[PDB]
């Protein structure tokens, strides 16, 4: 939801995500920058970090 | 002959020009003098046409006058405007931020119908700003400009529109008065013909016909022959128009008591009276010239119209099928065409006069409402003119316009040409034009009617490529605003000396020839078939007598800045555009050197720009100096001229004027006396002539970069002075008051050692970042807040200007003092700085080479600048090459060998070119210049040096040596003299850096801009280009501990300065904001782990 | 002594591929402009007709390493669309070799 | 539809409120200017309006009054709360003091700039710089 | 059914407005001279119309 | 920190709001022209929304940065830094 | 246009062989930006 809420008709997204208690797991890198976290790529992913 | 102080500038031109370049900025002055009914314009108008030449203010004060309340008992009326003498001169206004204006007077009269009285007195309506001899209004110390504005002309405009579903061409209509009933007729998607009045719901069109008091019989009489009639005639509508009118009304103002009289009055008032219908004379004339209405008859008062509305539907119908002509029963015959939106017969020019007229109209409307109130509320016998007038609205409107309006622009005061183009600039964007919709490709393009009215080349390169042009040279403006270009009449095939200033509505109807169409003598042509233009810009090879008109010169369509580029026609429109737009951003230099190879339009461009100080009456120089000159005219008087030395322009550049005369020298009115910033003896000099080689050096002119010689840094050739104006204000506050003192809290004396006993630096000082220009003190006992020189500035002071409220100065409200320091820097050419010729050959210096290592001719002459080969052909700026060759010739003159006989290539050459000395200026006009054959046999002559040798071949090339290796160069190399410019794109104004400085306080981000010690923007594309690598710690950095993280940044700085290893980020501020903004919506974002 | 071996990133807007950003080792030149190797002027679409450039300093050691290794100018020779070199002789070098 | 929605809850005490959250002030720009003129936006008079209506209700229940007007004022309070959360869902929305509507919390994350369509627009960083460029032919790629 | 089309067109407008906001602006350019740019020749709404 | 792994979103039972907040709001007075100071127990207030300037009270008792974390029994605000006015919300509680 | 430009940048263009060479120039100097815009659009999508 962090990513699709960077897209349009957000309120629908946030609503549908709240009811289900959606819990984004931060698998992408379109969102790990929003959080100021290390993208999972390169000198990111556990295998190297 | 033409100009007295004209340094001999030989001309390669062959044709005879029957028209001198009109006043290049006469449009502004003419429009103003029309706005104030000045006497010169009076004689102009009377000598030509009308004999009751109303002004532009009187029109306003009259269309309004008389004025009365609804009861009509008491009325009022203005008349007889009039102007006083200015309160202050120009520089006298600059030196103290005053304004250039003149007291304005009036002569109003009050009357009462029951008493039949008259009280006529003269009133005062404030201080009216005024125009100088240049064309610039001054506004609060600054020199300003009010540019023109392209707009559509009021009048019928038709346009076919294809329904994207059913591809059936259906025409339309639109009556577009200056204001009032906004309307559009059309052929509806059905055979019927509906209307749309007030830009609203549609209705039949026969409805409005029988609304005016008409019947179906007369309709089917004057027109009943098109099918569309029946469709809209078969409505089975009540022939007595009593409801459909009321229906229209109830659509206008739903909720009205119904009455036939109501709709009658509404229709006769909103479409046929000045209340909400006025086709200003331009529009009534656009509707007269079309439809052939009231032919050969005055146009004063027919704005409202009952017949200009009826023939429009006839035009529309007869155009439906395509009836290719019309005739009003009493008018003239005109064709049935469609109307383009860009065609200048349909566009027009809101000159400054008209803008000011309109703002004054608005102010007077506000005053009108004020006096309406005061007059239907106040008791008679106590109100007379001085009591029935509140002026503040008028002054406030004028000042609002001159301050805010995007047309009231600062003067582009880099160099005379910049300012002279800011005038004559046609701006299709502003209040009243287009800003959002047509910013496409239908107005940002060229049109065949731009020939002699706008330069298709000169147009800014920023967001306004096409919305901003530049009026041409041989052009003027109709009183109506329609642009006009001259044309030589021609009949039977013999040209004439007559000249007619035509507009596109009078040129598309005819056949115009070309300038170079040769003529043997007496006016007769030379061929039987020539080239011509036509209606739709369709050039043609056609007969020699069919023609009806003829051009007046080449360079008729080009602007000024484009008429100064030699060998232009050998370039490409894009590079000439670049050159035009790169002469305006050229900085004045200490010594201005005239252009060796130039174009004739280089003297007028400085005579007609207001940066040369000329005489006014033939006489004798009596006293000379650097600042002041004292003439002794031959009439008995003594004119005194004052030169402005070291005056900061509106962009940072200097304005040093220097005199070109001595004592006793005779002069002649119009003869230059003192040069300006960028002039030498009276002709525009923006840059310098430089010895040029064209060759790839050892990798320093790579990719448009270029090289120079340290000589241009020793002899101060491309040196330029730049002046900066810093200032502060002393005012009051809560904790007391602000003061300007030398007493500074708890500092050393090294700082103050440059200041004086008052707080301001001693003139002649040498300052730099960290230097106190003026010592101010702010309470709380006090605060250390003085003025200080920013980062990157330095130089010597010139002037300290202190304006004090204690000594009667019109300072602001919350102010006690105003302090302005001027500093100056003598900047030299350096790596990174920008250079450019006149053909878009631009480049940033990449090296500056010791003269001892520059390729030198056998005579030792060390080449100054070195260009590159790989930039000329792939860009089509070959003109410089020619500019190069001719230059060399103009430097080492020639003597054609006529001893035998004038070679065939020197046949067309005119005399005075068969010989010339060394360092001799030249002039190769744009489209009548030195062809390639009169130049590829001129290089031959190329007089030798003192030692008898020619340092150049018959091809333009020399055999250069190398300064490093010593060995010669194998092949011959090009060499010459090219005229380059220095631009305002200096590194010292472009470099910028930051480690830790000021932040936003709102988003908690480093600020943006060198102006405020800002930071660089790491957008999204960069985020991507990083992710693609696999860099995730660098991105974390550039997003957390460099922009937002409020503790991370400081902990990082501190760890660094301590040597420690820096920590990891925390949580940014943007995410925090996101979370405490979501929580506002009652959404619980609960992090996990 | 505080600038040796410490790399810096160079960007030119617009940025249209990972080679629009590159790490260089800085030397010191008395001036106000930023020199630049003439082979990378393709990656950047940079010509010296008055263009500009932007610098960025890495601070952490991870970032210094990423510059030295992933984003250096000598380790980045080939365009990641075709495998064809992108820093090679273009205009005058070609004519000289020819 | 029923199944998706209900199974979503497979607690639903969120569709109605007897309390409300109020953001912190720094995120609502209302400052002063030299002279006595404010610098204010269209996202902060809404809490004031809602408190005004909750007050109009605070003296209409215990003070004693008929259910009719209490309930009408409750409807009005709800219509005013709808302005805090995206006023613009009833056609003509709440209009600002001068002429134009208000900016609501759902605008921060929905429209032109927002905070979701803006937290990726980039940044403005420290330890950086800008300058023109020239050609170093005497230089190695690194 | 004129309910969906509204949200469709508005989402497309917003996507194109983001596209435009994504490109560099004149306050951030690193070019020779200020030239023409997407943000002043076409609007998000036409940049949407011309992809449908 | 920034060891996060998941962001569970959902609705907030009205008590959660009360928990988020440090105080309520009871005064519909955004600011008073005078004093250049927002009202008390109102909007843009100074009781829940942090000490305005720096470790500051509205009374003027403990402006001493020496101490820290003391609420004022005359004006009710805690002297803390980082402009805590930004991370502080309040619960309106109607009926 | 069926009226070509029979003159080069060396032989020297005439006037009317030079007033028809501008149209396309301005057209292109405006089209460049729209091209960049459509490119940015495609790219942002492919990255999405
Ligand atoms: Mg460039
Ligand atoms: Zn206290």
Swiss-Prot record, chain A:
Highest taxon of source: Bacteria
Coiled-coil parts of chain: none
Family classification: Belongs to the RNA polymerase beta' chain family.
Function as written in the Swiss-Prot or TrEMBL entry: DNA-dependent RNA polymerase catalyzes the transcription of DNA into RNA using the four ribonucleoside triphosphates as substrates.
Subunit structure: The RNAP catalytic core consists of 2 alpha, 1 beta, 1 beta' and 1 omega subunit. When a sigma factor is associated with the core the holoenzyme is formed, which can initiate transcription.
The name this protein goes by in its record: DNA-directed RNA polymerase subunit beta'
Organism: Mycolicibacterium smegmatis (strain ATCC 700084 / mc(2)155) (Mycobacterium smegmatis)
Gene designation per UniProt: rpoC
Range covered out of full length: 1221 to 1269 of 1317
Curated annotation (Swiss-Prot), chain B:
GO biological process: DNA-templated transcription; response to antibiotic
Xref: PROSITE patterns: RNA_POL_BETA
UniProt effect for mutating residue 409 to K/L: Rifampicin (Rif) resistant
Keyword Transferase appears in the UniProt entry: yes
Effect caused by changing residue 412 to V: Rifampicin (Rif) resistant
Similarity-based family: Belongs to the RNA polymerase beta chain family.
Further remarks about this protein from its record: Mutations in the RRDR sequence (residues 423-449) confer rifampicin (Rif) resistance. Rif blocks transcription initiation but not elongation.
Protein's name in the database: DNA-directed RNA polymerase subunit beta
Organism the protein comes from: Mycolicibacterium smegmatis (strain ATCC 700084 / mc(2)155)
From Swiss-Prot, chain D:
Signal peptide range in chain numbering: none
Listed transmembrane segments: none
Family, similarity comment: Belongs to the RNA polymerase beta' chain family.
Subunit structure: The RNAP catalytic core consists of 2 alpha, 1 beta, 1 beta' and 1 omega subunit. When a sigma factor is associated with the core the holoenzyme is formed, which can initiate transcription.
Entry function: DNA-dependent RNA polymerase catalyzes the transcription of DNA into RNA using the four ribonucleoside triphosphates as substrates.
Name of the protein in its database record: DNA-directed RNA polymerase subunit beta'
Record lineage: Bacteria, Bacillati, Actinomycetota, Actinomycetes, Mycobacteriales
């Amino acid at each position: 939801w962090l990513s699709a809420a960077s897209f349009q008709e957000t309120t629908r997204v946030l609503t549908d995500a709240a009811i289900n208690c959606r819990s984004d797991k931060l698998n992408g890198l379109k969102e790990n920058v929003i959080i100021g976290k290390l993208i999972p790529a390169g000198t990111g992913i556990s295998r190297y970090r | 002959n033409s100009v007295p102080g004209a340094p001999n500038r030989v001309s390669f031109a062959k044709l005879r020009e029957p028209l001198e370049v009109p006043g290049l900025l006469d449009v502004q002055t003419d429009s103003f003098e029309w706005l104030v009914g000045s006497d010169r314009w009076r004689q102009a108008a009377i000598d030509r046409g009308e004999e009751n030449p109303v002004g532009g203010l009187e029109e306003v004060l009259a269309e309004l006058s008389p004025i009365e309340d609804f009861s009509g008992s008491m009325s009022l009326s203005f008349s007889d405007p009039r102007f006083d003498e200015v309160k202050a001169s120009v520089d006298e206004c600059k030196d103290k931020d005053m304004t250039y204006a003149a007291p304005l007077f009036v002569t109003a009269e009050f009357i009462n119908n029951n008493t039949g009285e008259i009280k006529s007195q003269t009133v005062f309506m404030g201080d009216f700003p005024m125009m100088t001899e240049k064309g610039t209004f001054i506004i609060n110390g600054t020199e300003r400009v009010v540019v023109s504005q392209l707009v559509r002309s009021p009048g019928v405009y038709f346009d076919e529109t294809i329904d994207k579903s059913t591809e059936k061409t259906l025409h339309s209509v639109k009556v577009i008065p200056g204001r009032g009933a906004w309307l559009e007729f059309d052929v509806d998607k059905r055979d019927t013909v509906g209307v749309r009045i007030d830009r609203k719901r549609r209705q039949p069109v026969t409805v409005l016909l029988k609304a005016l008091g008409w019947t179906n019989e007369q309709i089917v009489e004057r027109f009943g022959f098109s099918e569309i009639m029946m469709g809209t005639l078969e409505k089975d509508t009540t022939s007595g128009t009593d409801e459909a009118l009321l229906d229209i009304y109830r659509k206008l103002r739903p909720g009205e008591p119904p009455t036939k009289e109501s709709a009658q009055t509404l229709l006769e008032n909103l479409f046929f009276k000045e209340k909400r219908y006025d086709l200003a004379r331009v529009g009534r004339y656009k509707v007269n010239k079309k439809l052939g209405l009231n032919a050969g008859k005055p146009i004063t008062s027919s704005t409202l119209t009952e017949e200009d509305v009826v023939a429009t539907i006839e035009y529309l119908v007869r155009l439906h099928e395509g009836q290719t002509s019309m005739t009003v029963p009493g008018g003239v015959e005109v064709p049935v065409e469609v109307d383009d939106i860009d065609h200048f017969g349909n566009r027009r020019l809101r000159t400054v006069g008209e803008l000011i007229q309109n703002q004054i109209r608005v102010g007077l409307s506000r005053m009108e409402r004020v006096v309406r109130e005061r007059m239907t509320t106040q008791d008679v016998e106590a109100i007379t003119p001085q009591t029935l007038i509140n002026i503040r609205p008028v002054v406030a409107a004028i000042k609002e316009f001159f301050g805010t309006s995007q047309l009231s622009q600062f003067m582009d005061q880099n160099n005379p040409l910049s300012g002279l183009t800011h005038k004559r600039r046609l701006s299709a964007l502003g209040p009243g034009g287009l800003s959002r919709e047509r910013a496409g490709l239908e107005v940002r393009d060229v049109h065949p009617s731009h020939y002699g009215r706008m330069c298709p080349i000169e147009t800014p390169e920023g967001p306004n490529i096409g919305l901003i042009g530049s009026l041409s040279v041989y052009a003027r403006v109709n009183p109506f605003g329609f642009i006009e270009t001259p044309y030589r009449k021609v009949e039977n095939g013999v040209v004439t000396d007559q000249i007619d200033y035509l507009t596109a509505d009078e040129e598309d109807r005819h056949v115009v020839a070309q300038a170079n169409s040769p003529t043997d003598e007496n006016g007769r042509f030379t061929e039987d078939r020539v080239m011509v233009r036509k209606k739709g810009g369709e050039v043609e090879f056609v007969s020699a007598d069919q023609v009806d008109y003829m051009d007046v010169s080449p360079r008729q369509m080009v602007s000024v800045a484009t008429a100064m580029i030699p060998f232009l026609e050998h370039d490409d429109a894009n590079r000439a555009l670049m050159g035009a737009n790169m002469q305006r951003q050229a900085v004045p230099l200490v010594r201005s050197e005239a252009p060796l190879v130039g174009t004739g339009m280089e003297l007028r461009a400085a005579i007609d720009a207001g940066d040369v100080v000329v005489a006014d009456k033939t006489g004798v120089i009596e006293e000379v100096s650097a600042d002041y000159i004292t003439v002794m005219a031959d009439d008995g008087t003594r004119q005194s001229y004052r030169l402005r030395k070291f005056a900061r322009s509106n962009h940072g550049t200097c304005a040093n004027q220097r005199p070109i005369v001595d004592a006793g020298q005779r002069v002649e009115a119009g003869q230059v006396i003192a040069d300006g910033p960028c002039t030498q003896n009276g002709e525009m000099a923006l840059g310098k002539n430089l010895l040029v080689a064209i060759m790839p050096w050892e990798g320093h002119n790579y990719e448009d970069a270029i090289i120079l010689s340290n000589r241009l840094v020793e002899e101060d050739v491309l040196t330029s002075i730049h002046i900066e104006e810093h200032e502060i204000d002393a005012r009051d506050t809560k904790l007391g008051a602000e003061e300007i003192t030398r007493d500074i809290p708890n500092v050393s004396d090294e700082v103050l050692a440059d200041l004086d006993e008052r707080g301001i630096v001693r003139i002649g000082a040498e300052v730099r970042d960290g230097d106190i220009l003026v010592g101010k003190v702010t309470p709380k006992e006090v605060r250390d807040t003085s003025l200080k020189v920013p980062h990157g500035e330095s130089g010597k002071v010139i002037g300290i200007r202190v304006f004090s409220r204690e000594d009667d100065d019109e300072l602001p409200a919350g102010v006690n003092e105003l302090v302005r320091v001027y500093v100056a820097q003598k900047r030299k050419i350096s790596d990174g700085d920008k250079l450019a010729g006149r053909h878009g050959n631009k480049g940033v210096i990449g090296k500056i080479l010791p003269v001892e290592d520059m390729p030198f001719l056998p005579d030792g002459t060390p080449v100054d600048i070195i260009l590159n080969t790989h930039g000329v052909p792939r860009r089509m700026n070959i003109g410089q090459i020619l500019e190069t060759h001719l230059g060399w010739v103009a430097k080492a003159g020639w003597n054609i060998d006529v001893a035998a006989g004038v070679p065939d290539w020197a046949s067309k050459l005119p005399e005075e070119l068969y010989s010339a000395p060394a360092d001799s200026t030249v002039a190769t006009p744009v489209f009548d210049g030195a062809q390639e054959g009169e130049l590829a046999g001129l290089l031959g002559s190329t007089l030798p040096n003192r030692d008898g040798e020619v340092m150049v071949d018959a091809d333009g090339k020399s055999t250069l040596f190398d300064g490093r290796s010593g060995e010669p160069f194998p092949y011959p190399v090009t060499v010459g003299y090219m005229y380059i410019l220095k631009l305002h794109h200096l590194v010292d104004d472009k470099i910028h850096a930051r480690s830790t400085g000021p932040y936003s306080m709102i988003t908690q981000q480093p600020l943006g801009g060198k102006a405020q010690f800002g930071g660089q923007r790491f957008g999204e594309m960069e985020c991507w280009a990083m992710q693609a690598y696999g860099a995730a710690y660098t991105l974390q950095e550039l997003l957390t501990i460099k922009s937002d993280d409020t503790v991370g940044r400081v902990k990082v700085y501190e760890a660094i300065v301590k040597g420690e290893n820096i920590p990891e980020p925390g949580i940014p501020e943007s995410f925090k904001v996101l979370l405490k903004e979501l929580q506002s919506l009652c959404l619980n974002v609960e992090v996990l782990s | 002594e505080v600038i040796a071996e410490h790399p810096v990133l160079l960007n030119r807007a617009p940025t249209l591929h990972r080679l629009g950003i590159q790490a260089f080792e800085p030397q010191l030149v008395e001036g106000k402009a930023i020199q630049l190797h003439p082979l990378v002027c393709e990656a950047f679409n940079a010509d010296f007709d008055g263009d500009q450039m932007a610098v960025h300093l890495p601070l952490s050691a991870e970032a210094q390493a990423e510059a030295r290794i992933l984003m250096l100018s000598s380790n980045n020779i080939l365009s990641p669309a075709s495998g064809k070199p992108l820093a090679m002789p273009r205009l005058d070098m070609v004519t000289g070799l020819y | 539809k029923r199944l998706k929605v209900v199974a979503a809850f497979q607690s639903p005490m969120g569709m109605v409120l007897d309390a409300v959250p109020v953001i912190p002030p720094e995120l609502r720009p209302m400052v002063q200017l030299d002279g006595g003129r404010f610098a204010t936006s269209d996202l902060n008079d809404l809490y004031r309006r809602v408190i005004n209506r909750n007050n109009r209700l605070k003296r209409l229940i215990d003070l004693g009054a008929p259910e009719i007007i209490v309930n009408n004022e409750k409807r009005m309070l709800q219509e005013s709360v709808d302005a805090l959360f995206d006023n613009g869902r009833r056609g003509r929305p709440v209009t600002g003091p001068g002429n134009r509507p208000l900016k609501s919390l759902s605008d921060l994350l929905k429209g032109k700039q927002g905070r979701f369509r803006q937290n990726l627009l980039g940044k403005r960083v420290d330890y950086s710089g800008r300058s023109v460029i020239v050609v170093g032919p005497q230089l190695k790629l690194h | 059914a004129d309910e969906a089309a509204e949200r469709e067109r508005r989402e497309e407008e917003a996507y194109a407005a983001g596209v435009l906001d994504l490109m560099v602006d004149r306050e951030d350019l690193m070019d020779d001279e200020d030239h023409l740019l997407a943000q002043d020749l076409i609007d998000a709404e036409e940049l949407a119309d011309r992809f449908k | 920190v920034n060891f996060f792994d998941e962001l569970r979103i959902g609705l907030a039972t009205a008590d959660d709001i009360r928990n988020w907040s440090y105080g309520e709001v009871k005064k519909p007075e955004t600011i008073n022209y005078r004093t250049l100071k927002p009202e008390k127990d109102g909007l843009f207030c100074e009781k829940i929304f942090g000490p305005t300037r720096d470790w500051e009270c509205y009374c003027g008792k403990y402006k001493r940065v020496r101490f820290k974390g003391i609420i004022c029994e005359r004006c009710g605000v805690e002297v803390t830094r980082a402009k805590v006015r930004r991370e502080r919300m309040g619960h309106i509680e109607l009926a | 246009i069926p009226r070509p430009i029979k003159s080069s940048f060396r032989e020297g263009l005439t006037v009317l062989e030079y007033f028809i060479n501008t149209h396309g120039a301005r057209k292109g100097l405006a089209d460049t930006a729209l091209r960049t815009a459509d490119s940015g659009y495609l790219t942002r999508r492919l990255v999405d």
